[PDB]
Structures are given as C-alpha cells and as structure tokens.
C-alpha cells in the first residue's frame, strides 16, 4: 500500500492489511497466540517470536495510523497514558526539563507532577498559544515541549509550526497529542512535530469499547526505541482490542465528518443563548487561535466547551438534564456525551495552573441527528429556569 | 466468597464473581464499555467511571487471583513484564537499591540493568539459594529483594521465609515472582513476601493467548499505589483478555497437577539418558534446594531443563528433532513447548551473571498424554546419536 | 426509547441499549454466559434463563433493528439463509405455495428449489417487477410471496405497495429481504410487506466480519412463532456476533450515505464508457423501475452490476484487473469487493430462470475515496484493451 | 495429526490445527472474516470463500471434535438443537418414521413432536433400555433411531452395540446424542452408530460461555450432506464461539476426569441419606443398566439426579438452599448447576411419556473441592427438616 497516493479513507481501510496470500480472508485475522513456532532456535518463521515483542493483528493497526499521519512508523500501546509515559520515558532522563501547556489532560500532568518530578525530571508551564511564552521557557536541558491542541478542556490552540521552529538549534523535541482532532483533521508531522501521540480509546476507535494509545514518528531510531520499550515494559494491547481499534478506525472519517457538522450546529445554537457565557469551539471566529487553527485543520472537531452564566450551579444542573447526551468521562464516541471537567477528568489538576472553571461543561458530540441533539440542549438550557 | 474457608478449585471458579443481581449471569459479563454513565457530576452508580481507573470485568480477575493467594489485594496489568515495571516504580526510587538473583527471567534483568539503572537505581546480583549472600547484599538503601522461585530456566529454588526474616529491621521489601509455581503450588505471602508478581501470559491462562500480569499483597497501601498506577500510567488489560485469562484461571488446579505428573516422569526418563548430562527438576533429590522446594511448594511443576553432554550443538538439534513438543518461545499452556534460553528468551541476559549454558534446553511439559511425550522425547534423543 | 420521535442516527445508536441500572456501562455488556442463575424454580432473575432461549445482548441488537424498520418486533439468527429457513418453517407447510422472483440470491432460490420441494412445497417464479405477472401467479395455496428489491445481481426492482396490495383478500404474506438497501434507505413494512428480513452480514454489519440474520415485524404472533422457533431450533447468532453486529449498525447511516455517494460517481463513469454495453444501477433514468425505485428508496444505494461489450472474457479480465477492490465473495462492508454472479454466488441459480449472464460482474462500492475507486475501475477498464 | 496413534489429550490439544506455515502462531487464528480473496473468479487462495460455506476457524474445532471420536468427519453447528434439526432433515422426509427414548432431552422431543410431525413425519416412543422394545417398533418406512445415553435428566443407558445390530437389513440409521458422556467417556461410533450428535454447549466447551452443535460421522455422503446443509440453511457457529470451543476443548480430559471423581463422591453420599428417595448415577450397582454402562463408558459421568422423599416440595426446597451449587439450567460446566426438570429443562416433555417426576433433581456436578460441594449438599439436605 502506498499513503502518499491514496486517500484517507482508503488508507484507513487498506494501510494495515492486504488480503494475505495464505488464506486471503478480507480482514487482518486476530492471532490470539502469545507465542510462535520457530524453524530452528531464534530463527522465525516469518518475523513473530512472542506478542509482547510483536503480533501481526496489533502491527497491522500500527501501520494504519502510521499511514493516516504520514508517518513511516507507529507503535501501539495499552492506552494513551501508557503510551505518554513510554514517550516520557525515551525522551527524557533524571535532570532533564519539559515545557507543557496550561490546558492539559489532566492525567498527563498528573503523570508529570506526581510521578516524573520524584524521578528528577523538572518541568514548567507556559501558555503554549503564546509562541513568545514557549520561546521563553526553553532552557538547555529542555527536551521535550509537549503540546496538546486543541486543548482537553478549554480547545485551546498552539501554532504547530511555529513552536516547531523554537526547537531548531536546541536538543527538545515537541510532540503533539492529536487525540482531539484525530489524523483526518490535523497531521503534525506535516508541520513539524517530532512525534505524535493518540489516546485510540477516543476517535480512533470511535465505540467507545476499547482504551489504547499510539505514538507515530518519522524517527527510526525513535521508532527502535518505541519498540525496546513496547517488548521490554510490556504495555502492549490485547489483540482482540487492536483489532476493535482498526475496526472503528475504517469509519473515522464518515463519523468524523457528522461529528463535525453536528457539532458546528450545537455550538451556533448555544452561541445565540443567554444561559451561555462562552462556547468555546475552534470554529467560531472569536475563539482564541481560531485562525491557527483553520490553518492547520481541515475542520475544528467535535468537542465543545461551554461556561454557564450561572455558574457551578448552572453546569452541574445542565450536566443532569440532557436526556440524550449521557453525563460520562470520555470523548469521541459515536454516543454524544458531557461532563464536568472540574469534578471529574480533571479534579487531578486543581490547584495548579491547569484547574478549570467550574462553570464549565465539555461536551463530545456524537453522530446521532442533529435535530435530537438540538432537542436536548434546548430542553436542558430550559431546565435551568 | 469467603477464600479462607473454601478449596483451591473452588476458589478459582467462584471467588471473582457470583451471578450477579440484575440478570444472574453465570459468568461475569465482559464490559467492553470505556466509560459508564454517572448518576450526577462524580457519583458513580456502582463504583465505576472509565476503564483505564476500573472495570469490573478487570475486578473479577484480580480478585480471584487474590483469593488464591491468601491476599486480600490484587491487581491486574497488560503482561508480567508491565507489573514488574510498576511494582518496581512504587517501591525505588533514585538512589535506591535493589538485591537480585543470579538466575532470572531475562527480561527482568533487561529492565533494571537498562532501564533502571538510567533512573538512578543500584542493584546486586547474588545467589539467592545462599541466605548469607542474600543478607551480605543487603545495604542501607534496599528496598527491594526480587526472587523467582522457581528459577527461569534453571530451576533455583529459594528459602522464601528465610529470606523473608532477613528483611526485619529494614526498609527491604521481598518481592517473589510467582510465575513457575503458580499459586496452586505455593503461597509466597503465607511465608513472608510483601508482594507477589505473575506473568499470567503463563499458567494462570494456561491458554496461550492472552498476555497479562497481576500483582497481589496484604498491605492495603500497596493495594492504594498499585490502584494509583494502574490508572496514572495505564498499562492495564483488556476486557477480553481479563475475561479469557479469568477462563482459563478456572482449571489451573485440573491442568497443574497433569502437567506435574507429566513433569515427574519426563524428568525421571531424561535422567536415565546418556545424552543428558544434568536434569534440573525441582523434584529430583539432587537438584540443589529439593529440601526446600519440597517443603514451600505442593508440587514441582511442570518446567524441566536439561543440560546435553554433547553441548550446544545436541542441545540445538533436540530442538529441532521433536515432533509433538513445539519449539517456541513461553510457557505454562497445555501444549508442550521448548526453546534454547542462550539464544532465545535469555539472549538479553549474555555478559551478566545470568547467562545461561549454551547446552541447556527449557522444556514446559504441556497436558497431553505421558504416553506421547515420552515417545516423541526419546525419539528425539535418538535423533542426536 | 421511542423510535417514532427519534432520527435514525439516533435510534441506530440508543434503540437496543441505554446505560443499565447495575453499573451503567455506555455499551451493552457481552453476556458470554449460556445460563442465567434463577430466584426459585422457573422464576427468572431478570427474564433471561438459556441464551438459545434468549440473551441480554442478542436482544439489544434485535430491538435496534426492529426501531430502524419501524417495527415492534425483531429476532436474530445465525445468518440470513437461517433466518430465511424459519421464516419459511413458519409461513408454509407441505401443500403450500410460494411466488418467487426471477432475479435472486442464489442461495434463496436453491433452499426452496432443493430443499423445501422435497418436504411438499410448491414454487412459481415471476418478475415481481411487473405487477399482473405477480397477481396471477397467486392460487388459493399460496401463503408466501418473497420479494427483493433491488434483487442481488441485477438491482431489478419490485412496487411494494403494489405488490403488497395483492394480498388483500388471500392468505398469502409478503415478505421483503431489504438486506441491499439497508432499513436507511428502505422500509418495507412502511408500504404494506408482512415481515422483512435482513442478512446482517452485509450492510448491517457493515465490517466483513459477522454473518447474521434478522427478521422483523409488527405482528405480535409472528414475533411468538420466531421466537419459538429461534429456541427450538436453535440458530442463534454467538453473543460476540451480536455485539460486533451492533456495534456496526452504529455508523449504517454515515456508511450509507458514503456508499451511496461513491456508488453514484461510479456508476456514472461506467455508464461513459463503451467497454461496458449496460449498467445496472436503481438510480440511473433508464434503470428498470427507476421510477418505483425513487418513490420507495431514500437513495440507490451501493452496489452496481455492470454488463461487458466484450462478454465473459471481458467480465473476467475486469474481475481480475482490478487493485483496490477486492475479488470476493459478498457486499455491504466498508471495503470495495467485485465478483463474476454466474460462477460465484450465483452458480447455484444456472439451469433456473434465475440464471445470470456470463457478462455480468456485480460491485459492492465501499467507502474508500472516490478519487481512488475512479483511478481503480478506469485502469481496469483499460487493461481490457 | 495421526488420531489413531496418539492419546485422547494429545488430540483434545493438536488433532485440529498445528501451527501454520505463514506465521506459526501456537494457536489457530481467529478469522474474522465473512469473504476471503480469489486469485481468479471461483478459483480460492487455499480452500475458503464464504464463512458461511467454510472458515478455517469452524474447521479447526470440526476436525478436533471429530478425532475425539473416532471419526473422519465433523461438521459444527450453532447449537446442539441446530444440529439435530439439520441431521433430521438430512435423513427423514415426509412420510418417514423415527424411534426415540422415553427420556430425552425435551428440546429434541418438542422438534420432533411439534415440528417435524407438522411436516409428515411420523414417530414411535421406546424404552430404548430394551432392545426388544426397540426391535418391535422398527417399520418399514423408519429412517432414524435416536438413542441419548445416559439420558437427561434420569441417566438410562442404552445398549448401543445392541441397538445398532437392529439396524442391519434396514434402512434405519443409529444416531447417538453424545451430549452427557463426551468423547472422552464413550465413542458410539466404535460400536456402530452411523453418527454422533454433540451439544458443545456442555462439558466439550466447559466454561459455559459459548452455545453450540457438532456432528461427527464416518460417512462421507452424510459429511458431504452436513456440509451442504451447513452453507445452505446456515445455522453456523461465530468464529469467535468456534475458537473458545475448541479453547475448552484442551481440557476436556482433565476436567472430566475431576466433574467423575467428584460426582462419584456425591453420589454415594446422598444414597447414604434418607431425604432420598433415589439416586440416579450410573456408576451406582443397581441403576438401571450399570452392567451396560461399564462395558461403553470409560467413566460413569458427571451428572446425577435425586428424587426426594418428601416429593416436589422437598425437591424444590433442595434447589433454593444450595449455595455453591447453582440453581440455573445447563450442565457441562467447569461450576456446578442444578435444577427441577420438571419446571424447567423439561417442561416441554409434559403429558408425554418423557415427563419427568415432579420430586426428581438433576445435578451437573463441577470441578470444585470435593469437601466443598459435599459441605453444601449436606447442608442442603439438612435444610428440609
Ligand atoms: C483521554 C486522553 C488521554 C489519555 O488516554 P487514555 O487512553 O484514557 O489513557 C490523553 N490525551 C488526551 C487529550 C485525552 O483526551
Ligand atoms: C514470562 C515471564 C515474565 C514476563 O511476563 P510477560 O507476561 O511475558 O511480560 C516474568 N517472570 C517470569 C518468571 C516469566 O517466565
Ligand atoms: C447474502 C444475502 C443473503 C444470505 O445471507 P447470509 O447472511 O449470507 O446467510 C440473503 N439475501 C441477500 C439479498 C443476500 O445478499
Ligand atoms: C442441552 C442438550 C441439547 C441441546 O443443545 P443446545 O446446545 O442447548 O441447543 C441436546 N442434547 C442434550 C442431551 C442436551 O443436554
Ligand atoms: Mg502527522
Ligand atoms: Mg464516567
Ligand atoms: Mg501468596
Ligand atoms: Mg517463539
Ligand atoms: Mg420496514
Ligand atoms: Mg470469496
Ligand atoms: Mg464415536
Ligand atoms: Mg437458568
């Protein structure tokens, strides 16, 4: 397969697999087997020894999204924080210093501040959409500037290219978390970025039924380190789950493309309305980096954000009224859902710079119609009257 | 379920799950969900939120696990190699010191001598089967004793309680990896360990086909950090491979004791042979530390090395000469399978204290029939002359 | 959940399952068990006693597609050919009589022609495409007449309501096989059939990877009767199937739309060509029925049958030609598939009216981009030369 | 694989699939699939096309289940009712008569009794525990005698040998339901059935998990008809069903060796009891047909049925006051069940001669401890007074 030559779609059906020419069974066969026959000792008899160090059905999902991110190579992981702390764990050493953004995933500043700081890893946050901010933060044991954009809450932006051209002259890399704008919206690689990391438990897999993580690169010798670590800390996925993955990923642009319609509607609709102090969705002209972002992405997501005028109240009371969209932690699913950042995904990050309002609602909005989904943020906002 | 009043075999079927009180399943339902709906913002509706944090498909594994035990405490990851990782991380830190045997699973030894070590930790390798060396290497700034017994591949046995004293009047905690003998063999905590580690890939499964770890302790701190890292680094299971594991866990006591009889009499014909010149099996007389294998474990397992007279050369040739025994990496499923640890699993080990003899070969006598396993053996050793 | 306020995105992803009352997991649960545990004899926990009798998990699947058809009620089967087997148990007896169409799944056609003919039933086949050949073809033992529209290879297409008005004054049940057009584009209950049938192998699905089959229907005895029978003869579908099914549905509407995008751009492009003497598309102003086709069909859907200048050798050719879609059996999955209906699915039919010509080949247009399949069929097309 | 010289272990693990020559996985691979890619129009890559027709997979479990029998040919099937639903119509047609027992499963009684009567054929019901019965109720026009032994629920024994020399100079077919005993226990065809029906629902998947049929033969005309049934009606397991079958399969030795230890146990317990009234076991001097029993069966099997004293409020009682044993439906499994036939598996058999007493309880005793169930059916036991 080529993916210079070949669309999104088609990659995302086709990069991964080829009807093999034993069988020829149209979809990547799962080979639940942790082990395989050999011809003579370590001699293999077609590159597989022990699932841990490598399994077909997971290589298969690897070079799938390797394929859609323009990347030669792609690693596969137990999930997105597990991925994170293998790239951590590469890139960084005891007396080395990492720039973050102050809108963050609460669990990768966790994994930060209460793990690699005892580790001897020190670290500073800057707002990352001030390339002036990032620029002034780098030291000379900065190895790793680590960006997530949009944001998980806020869909904060951060120009790609331009804190790419920081590290030029310098040993950090930056590394982009693409989980929110997935490969179909935003390639990172294209713009600079050293390597890239996906929480597959969101849009990748799309159902909502299986957690993992990814990190592609153009870097061989980041790719040899991936795989050291992959066979040598053992976070690998279950083959049952990697197939799950590549399976949800042959629809992500379909399912990306109503999630993005619908979620251009819902963020109009609550724009117009006076229980709503801010929507933030990358797509409205006067959210912060808007044109950032329509550089850099093809369309500007499926997630929204949303601050009460009523506050904590307001929020919580909204969270328990919809009837449709369903109050849970996680995002990109076909099922739309909403949360409240502040009690939930990330009550790890109070007190530090990335707390989040706690008039704020995050909303996934799924690929259910549009008119039911307008039906139940109208009737919700109502609730609160 | 009360473990301290039932049966091993009991246990193992019955200690995870009980049909529950909505539908009565018999078996544990397979919540193939990465988030679960909440009653209001952080209030669960029965103790559940995302997967990566908890999943009861997940619980139900690693509370039977526990229960065999003796532990009150378990918890699961994506392999053996994962749970060692994370159980290494809670209990060191930079400037501590870990004590280590001189006979292990390679990649055991892989993780601390290059990952580790890069993150400020010392260790020691020592003969464990020797209690004073054990305590000689003990220094103000251990933390940890690591013991595997049986060793893999070579079959060392360790005094778990006598090493267990030794860390009285110290920060050192004894760790025992678990794997070989299984919990239907030995009981690591009930002798002392602070904490226990399996490969579950191995035994537990007994299947071949899915790959995991489990730890398990009696201190509810451990239990907290253990919890903590599960879902702050995420190298957790699958929902399948967390239900198949559970599956197959249920026979382990039926498996184990087959594969001990075929053990014990493999064992005794290869020490008739000529073409062998040392059997190392826990239950023969003469293997160092029979005394104490015969008093911690039930039983001597199903893992026999042998060690050919005419070197390398035979020891490779037996490989390659069976017919039944499959030639491939892992252990502990019903199919019989060996491999050659110099060139295979413990090539990571060359140039330590722990490289194997070139000569030795690593059998794990399988379930099939005595009858056929001992055919296809002697044929193979005929295959040498 | 109310199917009759809800769009079909909406009930594709809701109308089965919502978070239960026990842990609320976003998913329905896989209930992998084959028992249910009871309060007392014969006093269900929760309605579930033996899967074959009925499963949490089958059933969830079952209502989904029931909502998508406008139906009450629904059961699922192994595949469609056993779900076509029990409806025909159900509907005929020895003495009974069916009218066929001349244009059908070859696997249809030899159930009843081998298969039934041998327990007493009689068949006449007719093109249901012409209304007085239908009505005349009715006796006073008919109690079945089997439609498909479009019918698999030649997309012909049949009236519903018109042949459903029929049955007016007789014994005789209309049942359509809706499996190409999907519950999106069509819905036969809506214009008067009796009960459809779908095999959910197919867009369903939609992955390549579940055979399945399901019935649906708004009479409550004919619910009675597959129920009956979907325990006592027992061809259900594997609760693994069930959930992969599903979970499939879940994107039908954007897979759909795509199919039906990219299958209209093909169709077109054939149509330019002079290698090709027809094409077989319901959406083309020529296509037989074209008119009942646009009345009774959201969209045209994504198969086209195409029909060689150069006759057999050129339908082989193009078979063979062929680099991005698939030669292979089956249709409806993301992947593009083609094949040769005279010698492959439908080699079953040569003998019979139902006979295909040999310069056919029949095309499941995936969802890959259409850029790609264009360059694909256009470099085939050109291979013929 | 050679089935005829290697032990029944050996072949529950090996007779169906030995790691391939692509990759060499330990285990077949699970294809999920429903089409597999050709290499010219009907010419198949290595023998698959259709899941529906054949997978890999499916055949694997075939061929095993076959070799454990004696048998060159297997055929598996959705459930063991869809099995003996498609035997029935390969070897009856209207006008036709069977033999069947009177005791016997009552799904199997209900299929004959309500369906295949409605479709011309005929039946005759025997104590087939008398040959002479059997003998004088054979007609001319009879195609079938259908023996279960030892049948459900009261564990009759048939004399197959015997049964079988009645049907030379006939055109009767012999078919045994090899459900109760496995292939572990007896192997009809070595005696003269011309076919063997299993449920792989009970002890040949063994974790109660996965609903199945398999039919075994030497006949290549009757595998050449399964098969043609098989792809034609479709009632076809999921490869996933198939391989956690087969995954069970590998300990079909070892467990029932323990499930006959054990039930060995209980039942000379209870018929030390006076609550009981009788036990049912065959391994018991005076069942009926012990002598028979010992000469076919290797073991006396898992199962046991009571019948109470105190009658039908006892035996009920008996059911709600176990707590290890399970009150559910099903056997076979590694847990213990029990239940009231009369209310429950065989509330279909009512008004026939196959009605079961109302004070009978039939028990499917499970691997657990031995002292555990003995605990518990005490306990029970002692609940009634
Ligand atoms: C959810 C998420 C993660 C963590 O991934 P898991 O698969 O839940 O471990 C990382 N980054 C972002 C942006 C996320 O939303
Ligand atoms: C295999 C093994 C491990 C590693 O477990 P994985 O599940 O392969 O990561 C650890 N300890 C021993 C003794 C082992 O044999
Ligand atoms: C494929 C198909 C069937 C048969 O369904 P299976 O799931 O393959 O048994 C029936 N009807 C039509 C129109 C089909 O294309
Ligand atoms: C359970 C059983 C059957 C029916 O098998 P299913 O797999 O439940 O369809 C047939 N025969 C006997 C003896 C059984 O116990
Ligand atoms: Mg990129
Ligand atoms: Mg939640
Ligand atoms: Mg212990
Ligand atoms: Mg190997
Ligand atoms: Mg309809
Ligand atoms: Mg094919
Ligand atoms: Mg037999
Ligand atoms: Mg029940």
């Not at 580790?119 to 800057?126: D, R």
Request: aromatic share 8%.
């Amino acid at each position: 397969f080529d993916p210079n030559t070949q669309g999104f779609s088609t990659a995302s059906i086709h990069a991964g697999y080829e009807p093999d020419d034993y069988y020829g069974s149209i979809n990547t066969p799962i080979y639940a087997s942790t082990t395989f026959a050999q011809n003579a000792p370590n001699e293999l008899r077609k590159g597989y020894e022990y699932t841990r160090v490598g399994n077909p059905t997971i290589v298969a999902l690897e070079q799938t999204v390797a394929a859609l991110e323009g990347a030669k190579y792609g690693r596969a992981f137990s999930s997105g924080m597990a991925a994170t702390d293998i790239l951590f764990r590469i890139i960084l050493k005891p007396g080395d210093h990492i720039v973050l953004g102050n809108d963050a995933y609460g669990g990768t500043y966790r994994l930060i501040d209460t793990v690699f700081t005892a580790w001897g890893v020190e670290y500073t946050v800057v707002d990352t959409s001030v390339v002036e901010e990032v620029k002034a933060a780098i030291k000379d044991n900065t190895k790793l500037i680590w960006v997530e954009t949009p944001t998980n809450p806020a869909l904060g932006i951060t120009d790609i290219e331009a804190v790419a051209k920081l590290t030029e002259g310098t040993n950090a890399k930056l590394v982009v978390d693409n989980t929110f704008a997935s490969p179909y919206l935003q390639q990172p690689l294209k713009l600079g970025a050293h390597a890239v990391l996906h929480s597959t438990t969101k849009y990748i897999g799309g159902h909502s039924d299986v957690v993992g993580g990814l990190v592609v690169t153009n870097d061989q010798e980041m790719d040899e380190e991936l795989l050291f670590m992959q066979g040598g800390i053992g976070p690998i996925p279950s083959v049952f789950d990697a197939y799950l993955t590549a399976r949800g990923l042959k629809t992500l642009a379909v399912r990306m493309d109503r999630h993005c319609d619908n979620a251009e509607k819902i963020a109009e609709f609550l724009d117009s309305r006076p229980e709503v102090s801010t929507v933030l969705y990358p797509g409205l002209k006067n959210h912060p980096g808007h044109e950032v972002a329509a550089k850099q992405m093809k369309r500007f997501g499926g997630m929204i954000s949303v601050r009460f005028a009523g506050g904590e109240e307001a929020a919580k009371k909204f969270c328990t009224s919809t009837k449709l969209i369903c109050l849970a932690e996680s995002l990109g699913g076909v099922e739309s859902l909403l949360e409240h950042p502040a009690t939930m995904t990330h009550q790890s990050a109070a007190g530090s710079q990335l707390e989040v309002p706690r008039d704020l609602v995050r909303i996934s909005i799924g690929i259910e119609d549009i008119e039911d989904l307008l039906a139940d943020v109208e009737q919700a906002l109502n609730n609160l009257h």
